[PDB]
Amino acid sequence: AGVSEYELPEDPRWELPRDRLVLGKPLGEGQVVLAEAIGLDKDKPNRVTKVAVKMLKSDATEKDLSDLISEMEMMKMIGKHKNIINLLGACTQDGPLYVIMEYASKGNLREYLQARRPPGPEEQLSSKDLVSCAYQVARGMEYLASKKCIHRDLAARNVLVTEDNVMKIADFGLARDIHHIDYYKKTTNGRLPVKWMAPEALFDRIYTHQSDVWSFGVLLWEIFTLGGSPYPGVPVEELFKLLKEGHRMDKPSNCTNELYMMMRDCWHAVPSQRPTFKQLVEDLDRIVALTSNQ
Ligand SMILES: CN1CCN(c2ccc3[nH]c(-c4c(N)c5c(F)cccc5[nH]c4=O)nc3c2)CC1
Ligand SMILES: [Cl-]
Ligand SMILES: [Cl-]
C-alpha cells in the first residue's frame, strides 16, 4: 500500500512484540481498538491486560503517520499519572504502527453521566461523587499543566472512566493545526467543540493553560447537568455574539452556589484572573471533604 515511506526508529524502552498483542473490537474512530496484551510487564509474562490500541486507517497519509508518532513521543515525554490515559507500549517494527494505551472500560464521561440520570440502566450519583469526578479531572489537568502540556480540547467527551470509576484525561498529546480548525464541524454526539473554547482561543487562536481552565469550567457545567449540552440550539455565529456580549451559562438545577461560583471564575473575561488548576485542585479537595454522600 506504500506503508511506509520512511523508517521508524526502534525504542527498547517501549517496544512490544506484535504477537503479544491480541486485537479485539473497535472502540472508536486513526482508530482505537480493544486488545489483550500478553506479558506487558516483563516480569510477569503469563498475564493478559486489556489495553486500547491506536493505529492508522488504510487511507492514512505520511502526515497521519507523523501525527500519531508525535502523540506517542509526547506521551513518552509527559510521564505517568493516575488521572490521564497513559502510554503502555508500542509496536513500531516490521508492520503498521500500534500505540498501546490504557483501557477505560466504562467509556467517556459524557455518556457515563447521561446513563446515570434519574429515569423518566445503572444507579444515580451523589453530590459527593460528582464533586469527586471534578476533583479527579482537575488533578489530571494540574499534572499536565505542571508538565507544560496545553490540552486545547478539554471536554467530558475526552475524559474516560475506568472499571474502578477513575477519571482519566485523554487525547492530551494530539498534534492538531489550530488554524485549519473548522468552527462548523460537529462532534459525533452532534455538538460544536467551539462551545468549550475560551474567547481568546476562539477569536484570537491563543491557547494557554488559562484557556484550558475555561474549558474546565464548561466540563464542570457538564458534570453538574449530568452530561448536558452547552448552549443547546445555538449556532457558531450566535455563539460568537453571546461571548462578545459577555453571556455565561445559567447555574445548573442541582448545584451549589460555591461550585457555580467556581464555574464563573473559570469563565473570567480576563485570563490572568481565572484560577489555576492547582488552586482548583485545592478548592475541590476542600469541597469534596465537605460534601455529603447522601
Ligand atoms: C457498554 N460499554 C459502553 C462503554 N464502553 C466503552 C466504549 C467506548 C470506549 N472507548 C474507550 C477508550 C478510547 N476510546 C481510548 C482512546 F480513544 C485513546 C486512548 C485510550 C483509550 N482508551 C479507552 O478505553 N473505552 C471505551 C469503553 C464499553 C462498553
Ligand atoms: Cl514515569
Ligand atoms: Cl460532547
State the DSSP string of 127-153. Answer: HHHHHHHHHHHHHHHHHHHHTT---S-
Q: What's the one-letter identity of residue 76?
A: K
Cβ neighbours around 119 below 10 Å, total: 5
Residue 207 · residue 196 · CB < 8 Å: no
Q: Which three cell numbers stand for residue 111?
A: 455518556
- Give Cα 278 to chain centroid, integer Å: 18
Closest CA to 80 of 23, 21, 14: 14
Q: Is 93 helix (H, G, I), strand (E, B) or coil?
A: coil
Answer whether 34 contacts ligand 1 (Cβ < 6 A): no
Q: Which helix (H) or strand (E) holds 87?
A: strand 87-91
Answer whether 160 contacts ligand 1 (Cβ < 6 A): yes
Q: How far apart are CA 217 and CA 240, in angstroms?
A: 18
Q: Which three cell numbers stand for residue 287?
A: 469541597
Ligand 1: nearest atom to the Cα of 112: 4
Q: How far apart are CA 240 and CA 203, in angstroms?
A: 8
Closest CA to 97 of 62, 64, 56, 63: 56
Give the residues across from 15 on adjacent strands: 90
Number of helical (H) and strand (E) elements in the chain, helices listed first: 8, 7
Instruction: Tell me the DSSP string of 97-111.
Output: -EEEEE--TT-BHHH
- Rounded to the nearest whole angstrom, what is the distance from the C-alpha of residue 96 to the centroid of ligand 3? 30
Q: How far apart are CA 218 and CA 51, in angstroms?
A: 29
Q: Look-up: residue for cell 484572573? A: 273
The answer, yes or no, to whether the previous bond of 126 is cis (omega within 30 of 0) is no
Give the residues across from 102 on adjacent strands: 51
Q: Which helix (H) or strand (E) holds 219?
A: helix 209-224
Residue 126 · residue 293 · CB < 8 Å: yes
Q: Is 97 helix (H, G, I), strand (E, B) or coil?
A: coil
Q: How far apart are CA 68 and CA 187, in angstroms?
A: 20
Domain range list for the chain: 8-103, 104-289
Residue 198 · residue 271 · CB < 8 Å: yes
Instruction: Tell me the DSSP string of 243-286.
Output: HHTT--PPPPSS--HHHHHHHHHHT-SSGGGSPPHHHHHHHHHH
Q: Look-up: residue for cell 508492520? A: 95
Q: According to the annotation, is 29 in a ligand binding site?
A: yes
- Give Cα 117 to chain centroid, integer Å: 22
C-alpha distance from residue 134 to each of 83, 92, 127, 273 (Å):
11, 36, 11, 20
Answer whether 68 contacts ligand 1 (Cβ < 6 A): no
73: buried, middle or exposed (CB in 10 Å: 19+, 13-18, 0-12)?
Answer: middle
Check for a shared fold between 8-103 and 104-289: no
Technique behind this structure?
Answer: X-ray
Identify the CATH class of 8-103: alpha beta
Contacts of 291 (CB under 8 A, 6+ apart): 127, 128, 131
Q: Is 3 helix (H, G, I), strand (E, B) or coil?
A: coil
132 φ/ψ sector (left φ>0, alpha ψ -120 to 50, else beta): alpha
**104-289: CATH topology:** Transferase(Phosphotransferase); domain 1 (1.10.510)
The resolution, in Å, is: 2.0
Q: What's the one-letter identity of residue 180?
A: H
Residue 11 · residue 75 · CB < 8 Å: no
Is 64 assigned a catalytic role?
no
* Helix, strand, coil abundance in the chain, percent, nearest 5: 40, 15, 45
Q: According to the annotation, is 138 in a ligand binding site?
A: no
Contacts of 18 (CB under 8 A, 6+ apart): 91, 94, 95, 98
Q: How far apart are CA 149 and CA 173, in angstroms?
A: 8
